[PDB]
Amino acid sequence: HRRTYVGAMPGKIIQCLKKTKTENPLILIDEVDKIGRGYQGDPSSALL
Amino acid sequence: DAIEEKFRERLKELVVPKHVMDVVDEELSKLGLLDNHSSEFNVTRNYLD
Amino acid sequence: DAIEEKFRERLKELVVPKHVMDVVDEELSKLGLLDNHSSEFNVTRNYLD
């Protein structure tokens, strides 16, 4: 989130980066087929 | 810390997963960072409960 | 400054881009202006962490 919303915390990727401590891990996106393509903001544009 | 510690002794009886352990504990840390007056803190308080 | 100093030795090992270097520097100073107890200081503290 923007960090200006109350309670904002960084997106998942930063958390994985925080955990693995490497710059070059092996991310494993799962189940791409069932990503939610709704009116509420399509993540599939975000993945690009 | 009164709510936090009654829930902490709660936590001490039930064997929480280490994942859920760190989640409840870091949420408790965010309780400590969040000011008591904020409605955001009331939401996280209700969440902790 | 103790928190910023553990941060700065941290940064002394890993080699940051000069971009994020200057960003953390101005945020570090912006933290340093901030009160030791202000709620926003806790926010920027957790953020700088």
Q: Considering only CA atoms, which of C46, C28, C21 is closest in space to residue A18?
A: C46
B27: exposed, middle or buried (C-beta count within 10 Å: 0-12, 13-18, 19+)?
middle
Chains touching chain C, criterion 3+ CB pairs below 8 Å: B
Residue at token pair 């806790």: C42
Q: How far is the first Cα of chain C from the last one, in angstroms, to the nearest whole number?
A: 13
Report yes or no: B13 at the C interface, CB cutoff 8 Å: no
Q: Resolution for this model in angstroms, one decimal place? A: 12.0
Q: How far apart are CA B13 and CA C22, in angstroms?
A: 48
List Cα–Cα distances, B30 to A10, A20, C30, C31, in angstroms.
14, 22, 22, 19
Could you tell me the two tokens for A20? Answer: 């693995």
Do the Cβ atoms of B29 and B8 come closer than 8 Å?
Answer: no
Determination technique for this PDB entry? cryo-EM
Do the Cβ atoms of C12 and C5 come closer than 8 Å?
Answer: no
Residues 6+ apart with CB under 8 A from B44: A7, B27, B30, B31, B34
Report yes or no: B37 at the C interface, CB cutoff 8 Å: no
Q: How far apart are CA C1 and CA B2, in angstroms?
A: 31
